[PDB]
Every structure is written in structure tokens, then in C-alpha cells.
Amino acid sequence: QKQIANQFNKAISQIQESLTTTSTALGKLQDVVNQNAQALNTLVKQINASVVNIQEEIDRLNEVAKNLNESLIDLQEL
Amino acid sequence: QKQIANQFNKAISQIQESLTTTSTALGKLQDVVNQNAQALNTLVKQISGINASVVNIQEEIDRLNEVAKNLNESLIDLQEL
Amino acid sequence: QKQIANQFNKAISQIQESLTTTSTALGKLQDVVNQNAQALNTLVKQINASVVNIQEEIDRLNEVAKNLN
Amino acid sequence: NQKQIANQFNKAISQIQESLTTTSTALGKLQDVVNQNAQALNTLVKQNASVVNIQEEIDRLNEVAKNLNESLIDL
Amino acid sequence: NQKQIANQFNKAISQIQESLTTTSTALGKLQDVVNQNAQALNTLVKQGINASVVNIQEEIDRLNEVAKNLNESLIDL
Amino acid sequence: NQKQIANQFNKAISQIQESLTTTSTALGKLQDVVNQNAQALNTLVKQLINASVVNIQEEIDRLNEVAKNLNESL
């Protein structure tokens, strides 16, 4: 498995990479959509353009891509 | 291989929390993108190229969850090693 | 022993057919948040409005998925 | 004749032309409202659904409310 | 060449007339239902929120008389 | 004479042909959103006043045929 191991460890680091990316997108998004809300809504000041809050989900997306660290084999086997 | 199998079995349960989560983020922007693109054109009926577009992801959202669910058949043979 | 890591291969697959989806999804949400930006302005015009570019991200997820293979 | 012919054509078209605008000024209300309600339900339920996007389609036909134009009169 | 263009022109049109006939009905239905939804919908709210307006009268009617005019633009033998 | 028409016509029929598919589709898919909630509505009650589906399959099974059945015109 020594070999079988690494595959696991490797087929792992990649994921967190994603996870990173994922919670990385939304970012700009919640922001963009959060400004166009504030600008569009702001035009009206001559009916109310709602807002979006998704922060909580995002930082809970990393704490995980940070957890998956330990699921990585230890390389004590033999 | 006491921690090994586990470690793996672990990886899943964390990952799976990501997918479920993620969706919600997405189903959370889908509403308000669709909500605002609806208050926009409303303010307008009050000029044509100014059409407020819609967004549907539900089926992209739905796919992630058999995916998060079915993983529950991957988990290694806990007590049978 | 075939049945040992069997789950494994089978596992990695699924996770893959997720970021695909995940990315297949964002581009869209990406495509409508931008439009409405265009539309708006064109109201004050005919007050900025940010744009966004998740592209490289929408890109790499797919790749980060071919690695798994 | 002839001038009665082709002209009875320059009719079939300007006729079509309106139906296409209409067949697309209602469509854009059968989404402009299926997306108004679809909403509320959710907006309610909270205290699943789904929106409608048919702009590719609705503009496509609207675009043909022009090109049939280089298909009218003649001499 | 021309002694057979009438036909083409001919049938060529009568069809379009029912496709658009078709379009007047169909579109018509989704006008009802959608309101037999804001209905169910709205009706729920009392037992603010409000499933709203949907009057696409115009269109179907218009699509109708356009349906009546084309036999007119039909070359006559 | 007509050789700058018998094609302006053969041309004419196209934009039209392809305005039917855009029609159907414009409802074939919108058809769904209406019977979608037409049930998310029910379930909002079921468990706890009527959701009528919608059925325009034929209307959407017409517009398409008047399309193929239009190749006899050249």
C-alpha cells in the first residue's frame, strides 16, 4: 500500500485546492451582488433592492480544507 | 491499518459537509440575484434593452446532493477488516 | 483486497462530478450577476456597479478534477 | 398579376413580423410573472421552487422581427 | 417555374397560420394555470405577500386576427 | 425575374421555420417551471388549495411538425 498510500494523500491535497477555489469564488460574488444591490437600491433615492449575506458558509469551507490535512496518512506503515 | 481506513472514511464525512454547505451558499445567491433582477425591472415599469435577467441553478444544486448522499456507500468496511 | 480500495476509486469519482457541477453552476450565476450590472447602469446612463471575474477559478476546478483521474 | 403576386407575399411577411413580436411580448410575461410568483411562494415558505430564463429564446425570435425585412418589396 | 410557385406560396402559408393558431391556444392555457396558481398561492397567504398580475389578453387576441389575415395574402388562381 | 425571389422566398421560409422551434422551446421549457411550482405548491399544503398542472405537449407537438412538413416548399 506504501504506494497505494500516496495516491490517497495526493488524491487529497488536490481537493482542498478546490475547496479553496470554491470559497474563493463566492467571495467576489457576495461582494459584486452586494454592491449592485447597494448602487441599484441607491438609485431609487429620488423599491428597495434586497441584500445578500453568505459569509458564514465560506469560512466554514476553509476550516475544512484545513481539517482534511490530518486525514492524510502519516507514512508509518510497514 | 486502524487509522488508515478511518482517515479515509474520515476524508469523506468532511468533504460531504463541504458539498452540502456550498449548495446553500449558491441557493443563497440564486434567490437574491433573482430577487434583485426582479426589483430592477419593477423600478422600471415606473427603455427595452433594460431587461432584468433570471437565474436557475436548482438542478446544479440538486446534483451535488445524491453526490453528498451516495458517498454513504463509500465509507470503508468499518468493522470487517 | 480488490474490495478494499474499491470504495476509494468509486469515491474519488463522485467528488469529481461535483466541482464539475460546482463550476458548471458558478459560471451561470456568474453570467447573470454581470448582465444585471449592464442593465442597471444603462438606467442612470440612458453610480457604478462592480463586475466580477471568477474565471480562472471556474477554470481550475475542472482541471483540479482531471488530476484526481 | 405579378404585382399582385409578390405583394401578396410582402404581406405574408409583415403579418408574420407582428405575430413574432407578440408570440414574444407575452412569453416575456409568462416568465415575468412565473418568476414573480415562484418567488413569493419561496419568500413565504421560508417564514423546491424555480425561476424561468428564456431570454436567449425570447430575443432570438425578436431578432427575426428584423431579418425578414431584407425579404420584402422588389422591382 | 412560376406555374407552381402559387402552391408553394400557398400551403406554405396555411401552415404558419395554425402554428400561430396553436400558439394562441397554448400560450392561452399558461395564462389560466399561472393565475390558478397565484390563486392557490395568494389564497394561502390570508390563512404583505401577494401572487400578482397576469393579463396577456392582448397578445392571444392579436395572434388571432393575424391568424384570420393571410388567407388574404394568399395568391389567387 | 423570379430567380431573385424563388430564393428570397426559399430563404423567407427559414427564418420562419426556425421561429417555431424557438416558440415551442420557449414553452416546452417554461412549461416545466409552471408544473414545477404547480407541485411545490401542493406539497406546501399536502402535508398540512389546488395546483393545476399545465399540458401543452401537443401545442408543443405541433409547432415542431409544421416545421419539418415545410420542406416540400423550394
Side-chain angles (χ1 to χ4, degrees), chain A residues 1-25 27-78, chain B residues 1-15 17-68 70-81, chain C, chain D residues 1-3 5-75, chain E residues 1-19 21-26 28-35 37-77, chain F residues 1-64 66-74:
Chain A
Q1 311 183 321
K2 57 271 186 149
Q3 324 170 307
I4 308 293
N6 276 294
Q7 238 127 290
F8 176 56
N9 299 69
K10 279 192 199 71
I12 267 52
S13 175
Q14 239 67 74
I15 303 302
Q16 27 212 286
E17 283 291 11
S18 299
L19 284 173
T20 298
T21 298
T22 298
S23 43
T24 299
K28 310 167 198 193
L29 277 184
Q30 169 160 170
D31 311 294
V32 169
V33 172
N34 259 2
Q35 189 195 296
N36 286 61
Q38 183 192 285
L40 157 65
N41 187 306
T42 289
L43 168 44
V44 169
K45 274 171 191 173
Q46 254 54 302
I47 197 166
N48 319 313
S50 165
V51 191
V52 186
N53 160 72
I54 313 307
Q55 257 276 52
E56 188 167 277
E57 269 71 34
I58 287 173
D59 26 57
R60 152 156 77 232
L61 244 27
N62 300 315
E63 274 292 351
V64 187
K66 138 189 178 187
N67 286 159
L68 300 148
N69 224 57
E70 295 148 10
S71 292
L72 286 166
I73 314 296
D74 15 279
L75 219 54
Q76 306 162 163
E77 217 174 328
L78 325 153
Chain B
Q1 50 163 31
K2 289 197 161 198
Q3 307 168 46
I4 309 293
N6 202 317
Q7 297 179 71
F8 152 64
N9 258 351
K10 305 169 197 171
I12 294 301
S13 161
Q14 260 300 57
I15 279 170
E17 185 60 287
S18 288
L19 288 146
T20 310
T21 291
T22 300
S23 294
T24 325
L26 306 156
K28 282 187 292 266
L29 297 165
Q30 165 181 304
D31 294 315
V32 207
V33 164
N34 279 304
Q35 211 168 66
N36 301 46
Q38 211 270 174
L40 176 50
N41 67 68
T42 302
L43 160 90
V44 187
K45 278 165 192 163
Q46 329 299 51
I47 283 186
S48 186
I50 309 157
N51 43 75
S53 192
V54 179
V55 187
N56 166 252
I57 283 295
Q58 285 291 331
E59 242 200 53
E60 256 66 62
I61 294 177
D62 276 293
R63 280 210 209 185
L64 289 173
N65 300 140
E66 310 80 11
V67 195
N70 291 85
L71 298 172
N72 263 41
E73 205 278 88
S74 300
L75 291 183
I76 197 80
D77 46 64
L78 313 197
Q79 63 174 56
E80 191 165 49
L81 307 153
Chain C
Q1 165 149 47
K2 175 186 174 182
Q3 228 169 50
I4 303 275
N6 191 355
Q7 314 291 185
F8 196 46
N9 296 324
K10 286 196 172 196
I12 268 64
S13 173
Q14 310 182 71
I15 354 185
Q16 308 192 267
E17 183 123 1
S18 296
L19 319 147
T20 300
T21 304
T22 298
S23 71
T24 317
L26 287 146
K28 309 197 179 191
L29 206 167
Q30 185 170 321
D31 278 299
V32 179
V33 175
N34 264 294
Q35 177 298 295
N36 305 40
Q38 329 271 312
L40 171 68
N41 297 157
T42 312
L43 273 62
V44 189
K45 189 184 183 184
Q46 283 166 186
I47 311 185
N48 313 352
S50 183
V51 161
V52 54
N53 181 290
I54 310 178
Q55 208 49 60
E56 274 125 74
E57 302 173 77
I58 294 185
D59 290 301
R60 176 162 62 247
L61 276 156
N62 311 283
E63 177 185 306
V64 166
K66 201 170 195 173
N67 297 172
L68 302 176
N69 271 85
Chain D
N1 300 299
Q2 207 71 300
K3 276 180 187 173
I5 310 296
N7 162 79
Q8 289 210 197
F9 171 99
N10 291 189
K11 282 159 54 58
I13 273 72
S14 171
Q15 277 284 89
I16 304 300
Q17 283 178 61
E18 291 296 12
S19 289
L20 293 175
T21 305
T22 321
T23 310
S24 282
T25 253
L27 292 242
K29 292 187 180 159
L30 284 175
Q31 159 195 25
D32 195 5
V33 130
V34 167
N35 297 47
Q36 229 146 74
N37 293 5
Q39 181 266 291
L41 162 63
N42 279 319
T43 204
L44 164 126
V45 177
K46 223 173 230 63
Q47 345 182 318
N48 308 311
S50 259
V51 278
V52 183
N53 239 143
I54 181 228
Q55 282 290 171
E56 196 203 73
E57 246 60 78
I58 187 171
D59 285 291
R60 225 183 174 187
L61 282 172
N62 229 184
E63 281 180 58
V64 177
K66 300 188 292 56
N67 301 314
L68 289 167
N69 189 280
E70 186 259 309
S71 245
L72 279 188
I73 325 297
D74 275 292
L75 250 180
Chain E
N1 63 303
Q2 152 276 187
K3 58 164 295 193
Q4 243 149 296
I5 193 264
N7 292 322
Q8 306 275 304
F9 194 105
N10 299 161
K11 321 298 185 148
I13 191 171
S14 171
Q15 305 274 314
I16 298 155
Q17 327 177 304
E18 31 166 38
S19 293
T21 283
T22 331
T23 284
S24 332
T25 308
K29 299 187 168 200
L30 310 186
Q31 162 159 272
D32 302 359
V33 173
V34 166
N35 300 295
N37 250 55
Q39 169 261 291
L41 268 163
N42 220 188
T43 304
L44 231 211
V45 164
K46 289 178 183 180
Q47 308 157 287
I49 332 91
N50 195 202
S52 193
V53 191
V54 220
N55 155 167
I56 314 307
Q57 213 54 61
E58 315 153 290
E59 296 57 38
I60 313 302
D61 296 317
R62 295 218 234 85
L63 258 124
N64 269 184
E65 210 60 306
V66 164
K68 184 170 193 177
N69 312 208
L70 282 208
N71 254 62
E72 253 276 51
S73 316
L74 215 161
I75 324 309
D76 172 359
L77 187 179
Chain F
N1 312 290
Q2 289 180 291
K3 314 211 181 183
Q4 285 188 312
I5 296 169
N7 304 302
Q8 202 179 180
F9 169 43
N10 284 206
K11 279 165 155 294
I13 304 178
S14 262
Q15 311 226 304
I16 326 297
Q17 309 183 73
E18 335 177 78
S19 56
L20 302 174
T21 283
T22 299
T23 306
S24 335
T25 304
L27 307 188
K29 306 178 168 189
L30 156 70
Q31 148 99 71
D32 283 46
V33 201
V34 169
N35 310 177
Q36 170 148 333
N37 310 9
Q39 68 198 317
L41 249 159
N42 294 302
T43 318
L44 173 48
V45 162
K46 176 79 143 179
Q47 324 183 312
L48 292 86
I49 297 183
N50 195 206
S52 188
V53 301
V54 149
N55 178 319
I56 60 166
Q57 284 310 307
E58 292 231 48
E59 287 63 292
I60 312 276
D61 281 351
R62 160 48 60 265
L63 307 168
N64 298 285
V66 194
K68 199 162 200 165
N69 287 65
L70 281 195
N71 302 178
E72 342 293 89
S73 252
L74 300 184

PDB file of all heavy atoms in Angstrom, chain A residues 15-33, unseen atoms left out:
ATOM      1  N   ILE A  15      -8.161  18.159  -3.712  1.00  0.00           N
ATOM      2  CA  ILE A  15      -9.473  18.593  -3.240  1.00  0.00           C
ATOM      3  C   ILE A  15      -9.410  19.911  -2.493  1.00  0.00           C
ATOM      4  O   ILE A  15      -9.933  20.902  -2.966  1.00  0.00           O
ATOM      5  CB  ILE A  15     -10.130  17.548  -2.312  1.00  0.00           C
ATOM      6  CG1 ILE A  15     -10.250  16.193  -3.030  1.00  0.00           C
ATOM      7  CG2 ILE A  15     -11.499  18.036  -1.863  1.00  0.00           C
ATOM      8  CD1 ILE A  15     -11.045  16.207  -4.320  1.00  0.00           C
ATOM      9  N   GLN A  16      -8.766  19.937  -1.337  1.00  0.00           N
ATOM     10  CA  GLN A  16      -8.674  21.178  -0.587  1.00  0.00           C
ATOM     11  C   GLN A  16      -8.375  22.358  -1.525  1.00  0.00           C
ATOM     12  O   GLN A  16      -8.847  23.480  -1.302  1.00  0.00           O
ATOM     13  CB  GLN A  16      -7.622  21.036   0.535  1.00  0.00           C
ATOM     14  CG  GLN A  16      -6.517  20.028   0.248  1.00  0.00           C
ATOM     15  CD  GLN A  16      -5.983  19.325   1.498  1.00  0.00           C
ATOM     16  OE1 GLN A  16      -5.241  19.909   2.316  1.00  0.00           O
ATOM     17  NE2 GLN A  16      -6.367  18.052   1.649  1.00  0.00           N
ATOM     18  N   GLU A  17      -7.609  22.087  -2.582  1.00  0.00           N
ATOM     19  CA  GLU A  17      -7.255  23.103  -3.589  1.00  0.00           C
ATOM     20  C   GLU A  17      -8.561  23.677  -4.065  1.00  0.00           C
ATOM     21  O   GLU A  17      -8.768  24.898  -4.073  1.00  0.00           O
ATOM     22  CB  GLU A  17      -6.560  22.479  -4.807  1.00  0.00           C
ATOM     23  CG  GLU A  17      -5.110  22.116  -4.592  1.00  0.00           C
ATOM     24  CD  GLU A  17      -4.275  23.352  -4.461  1.00  0.00           C
ATOM     25  OE1 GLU A  17      -4.869  24.443  -4.324  1.00  0.00           O
ATOM     26  OE2 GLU A  17      -3.039  23.229  -4.492  1.00  0.00           O
ATOM     27  N   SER A  18      -9.431  22.758  -4.480  1.00  0.00           N
ATOM     28  CA  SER A  18     -10.759  23.109  -4.943  1.00  0.00           C
ATOM     29  C   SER A  18     -11.357  23.899  -3.815  1.00  0.00           C
ATOM     30  O   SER A  18     -11.383  25.115  -3.869  1.00  0.00           O
ATOM     31  CB  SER A  18     -11.594  21.865  -5.211  1.00  0.00           C
ATOM     32  OG  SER A  18     -10.974  21.082  -6.214  1.00  0.00           O
ATOM     33  N   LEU A  19     -11.824  23.213  -2.786  1.00  0.00           N
ATOM     34  CA  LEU A  19     -12.414  23.886  -1.637  1.00  0.00           C
ATOM     35  C   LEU A  19     -11.948  25.318  -1.530  1.00  0.00           C
ATOM     36  O   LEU A  19     -12.749  26.200  -1.318  1.00  0.00           O
ATOM     37  CB  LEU A  19     -12.083  23.133  -0.347  1.00  0.00           C
ATOM     38  CG  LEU A  19     -12.888  21.846  -0.112  1.00  0.00           C
ATOM     39  CD1 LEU A  19     -12.349  21.116   1.101  1.00  0.00           C
ATOM     40  CD2 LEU A  19     -14.362  22.199   0.074  1.00  0.00           C
ATOM     41  N   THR A  20     -10.643  25.546  -1.675  1.00  0.00           N
ATOM     42  CA  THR A  20     -10.061  26.905  -1.629  1.00  0.00           C
ATOM     43  C   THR A  20     -10.742  27.773  -2.659  1.00  0.00           C
ATOM     44  O   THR A  20     -11.327  28.825  -2.344  1.00  0.00           O
ATOM     45  CB  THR A  20      -8.564  26.928  -2.005  1.00  0.00           C
ATOM     46  OG1 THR A  20      -7.820  26.135  -1.069  1.00  0.00           O
ATOM     47  CG2 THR A  20      -8.054  28.368  -2.038  1.00  0.00           C
ATOM     48  N   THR A  21     -10.589  27.328  -3.902  1.00  0.00           N
ATOM     49  CA  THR A  21     -11.179  27.974  -5.059  1.00  0.00           C
ATOM     50  C   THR A  21     -12.655  28.268  -4.800  1.00  0.00           C
ATOM     51  O   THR A  21     -13.061  29.417  -4.870  1.00  0.00           O
ATOM     52  CB  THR A  21     -11.038  27.059  -6.290  1.00  0.00           C
ATOM     53  OG1 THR A  21      -9.643  26.836  -6.568  1.00  0.00           O
ATOM     54  CG2 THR A  21     -11.741  27.669  -7.492  1.00  0.00           C
ATOM     55  N   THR A  22     -13.436  27.229  -4.470  1.00  0.00           N
ATOM     56  CA  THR A  22     -14.879  27.360  -4.207  1.00  0.00           C
ATOM     57  C   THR A  22     -15.186  28.521  -3.293  1.00  0.00           C
ATOM     58  O   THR A  22     -15.818  29.476  -3.693  1.00  0.00           O
ATOM     59  CB  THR A  22     -15.486  26.121  -3.549  1.00  0.00           C
ATOM     60  OG1 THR A  22     -15.359  24.986  -4.410  1.00  0.00           O
ATOM     61  CG2 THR A  22     -16.940  26.358  -3.274  1.00  0.00           C
ATOM     62  N   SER A  23     -14.751  28.435  -2.043  1.00  0.00           N
ATOM     63  CA  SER A  23     -14.995  29.534  -1.114  1.00  0.00           C
ATOM     64  C   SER A  23     -14.299  30.798  -1.594  1.00  0.00           C
ATOM     65  O   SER A  23     -14.518  31.895  -1.063  1.00  0.00           O
ATOM     66  CB  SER A  23     -14.532  29.177   0.304  1.00  0.00           C
ATOM     67  OG  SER A  23     -13.282  28.525   0.279  1.00  0.00           O
ATOM     68  N   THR A  24     -13.468  30.661  -2.624  1.00  0.00           N
ATOM     69  CA  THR A  24     -12.801  31.841  -3.136  1.00  0.00           C
ATOM     70  C   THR A  24     -13.712  32.561  -4.129  1.00  0.00           C
ATOM     71  O   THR A  24     -13.743  33.794  -4.172  1.00  0.00           O
ATOM     72  CB  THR A  24     -11.444  31.497  -3.805  1.00  0.00           C
ATOM     73  OG1 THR A  24     -10.575  30.898  -2.834  1.00  0.00           O
ATOM     74  CG2 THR A  24     -10.788  32.762  -4.362  1.00  0.00           C
ATOM     75  N   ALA A  25     -14.456  31.798  -4.923  1.00  0.00           N
ATOM     76  CA  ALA A  25     -15.360  32.419  -5.875  1.00  0.00           C
ATOM     77  C   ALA A  25     -16.360  33.227  -5.023  1.00  0.00           C
ATOM     78  O   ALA A  25     -16.086  34.364  -4.679  1.00  0.00           O
ATOM     79  CB  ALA A  25     -16.057  31.373  -6.689  1.00  0.00           C
ATOM     80  N   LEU A  26     -17.472  32.620  -4.638  1.00  0.00           N
ATOM     81  CA  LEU A  26     -18.497  33.267  -3.809  1.00  0.00           C
ATOM     82  C   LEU A  26     -18.060  34.640  -3.339  1.00  0.00           C
ATOM     83  O   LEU A  26     -18.827  35.584  -3.399  1.00  0.00           O
ATOM     84  CB  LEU A  26     -18.832  32.382  -2.585  1.00  0.00           C
ATOM     85  N   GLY A  27     -16.828  34.727  -2.845  1.00  0.00           N
ATOM     86  CA  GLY A  27     -16.279  35.978  -2.360  1.00  0.00           C
ATOM     87  C   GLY A  27     -16.674  37.102  -3.272  1.00  0.00           C
ATOM     88  O   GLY A  27     -17.667  37.769  -3.040  1.00  0.00           O
ATOM     89  N   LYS A  28     -15.899  37.300  -4.319  1.00  0.00           N
ATOM     90  CA  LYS A  28     -16.190  38.338  -5.290  1.00  0.00           C
ATOM     91  C   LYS A  28     -17.709  38.453  -5.482  1.00  0.00           C
ATOM     92  O   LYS A  28     -18.256  39.555  -5.439  1.00  0.00           O
ATOM     93  CB  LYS A  28     -15.499  37.970  -6.596  1.00  0.00           C
ATOM     94  CG  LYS A  28     -14.066  37.643  -6.334  1.00  0.00           C
ATOM     95  CD  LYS A  28     -13.365  36.980  -7.482  1.00  0.00           C
ATOM     96  CE  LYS A  28     -12.109  36.304  -6.949  1.00  0.00           C
ATOM     97  NZ  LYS A  28     -11.138  35.846  -7.973  1.00  0.00           N
ATOM     98  N   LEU A  29     -18.376  37.301  -5.641  1.00  0.00           N
ATOM     99  CA  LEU A  29     -19.823  37.211  -5.861  1.00  0.00           C
ATOM    100  C   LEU A  29     -20.633  37.945  -4.795  1.00  0.00           C
ATOM    101  O   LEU A  29     -21.276  38.941  -5.092  1.00  0.00           O
ATOM    102  CB  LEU A  29     -20.264  35.752  -5.930  1.00  0.00           C
ATOM    103  CG  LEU A  29     -20.035  35.234  -7.304  1.00  0.00           C
ATOM    104  CD1 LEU A  29     -20.515  33.881  -7.490  1.00  0.00           C
ATOM    105  CD2 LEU A  29     -20.757  36.128  -8.135  1.00  0.00           C
ATOM    106  N   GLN A  30     -20.611  37.466  -3.557  1.00  0.00           N
ATOM    107  CA  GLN A  30     -21.350  38.109  -2.493  1.00  0.00           C
ATOM    108  C   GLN A  30     -21.051  39.576  -2.485  1.00  0.00           C
ATOM    109  O   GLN A  30     -21.881  40.360  -2.077  1.00  0.00           O
ATOM    110  CB  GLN A  30     -20.977  37.509  -1.149  1.00  0.00           C
ATOM    111  CG  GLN A  30     -21.489  38.280   0.046  1.00  0.00           C
ATOM    112  CD  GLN A  30     -21.530  37.433   1.319  1.00  0.00           C
ATOM    113  OE1 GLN A  30     -21.745  37.958   2.413  1.00  0.00           O
ATOM    114  NE2 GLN A  30     -21.334  36.127   1.169  1.00  0.00           N
ATOM    115  N   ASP A  31     -19.864  39.958  -2.960  1.00  0.00           N
ATOM    116  CA  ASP A  31     -19.457  41.370  -2.990  1.00  0.00           C
ATOM    117  C   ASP A  31     -20.089  42.069  -4.192  1.00  0.00           C
ATOM    118  O   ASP A  31     -20.827  43.039  -4.054  1.00  0.00           O
ATOM    119  CB  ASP A  31     -17.943  41.493  -3.105  1.00  0.00           C
ATOM    120  CG  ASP A  31     -17.213  40.628  -2.115  1.00  0.00           C
ATOM    121  OD1 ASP A  31     -17.319  40.887  -0.895  1.00  0.00           O
ATOM    122  OD2 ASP A  31     -16.531  39.681  -2.565  1.00  0.00           O
ATOM    123  N   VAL A  32     -19.782  41.577  -5.383  1.00  0.00           N
ATOM    124  CA  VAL A  32     -20.360  42.165  -6.573  1.00  0.00           C
ATOM    125  C   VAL A  32     -21.846  42.325  -6.308  1.00  0.00           C
ATOM    126  O   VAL A  32     -22.312  43.460  -6.146  1.00  0.00           O
ATOM    127  CB  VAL A  32     -20.143  41.279  -7.821  1.00  0.00           C
ATOM    128  CG1 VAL A  32     -21.000  41.799  -9.000  1.00  0.00           C
ATOM    129  CG2 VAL A  32     -18.662  41.296  -8.200  1.00  0.00           C
ATOM    130  N   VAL A  33     -22.574  41.204  -6.244  1.00  0.00           N
ATOM    131  CA  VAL A  33     -24.015  41.239  -5.990  1.00  0.00           C
ATOM    132  C   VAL A  33     -24.367  42.095  -4.771  1.00  0.00           C
ATOM    133  O   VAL A  33     -25.488  42.590  -4.663  1.00  0.00           O
ATOM    134  CB  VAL A  33     -24.606  39.826  -5.787  1.00  0.00           C
ATOM    135  CG1 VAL A  33     -26.062  39.914  -5.344  1.00  0.00           C
ATOM    136  CG2 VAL A  33     -24.510  39.047  -7.068  1.00  0.00           C
TER     137      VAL A  33
END
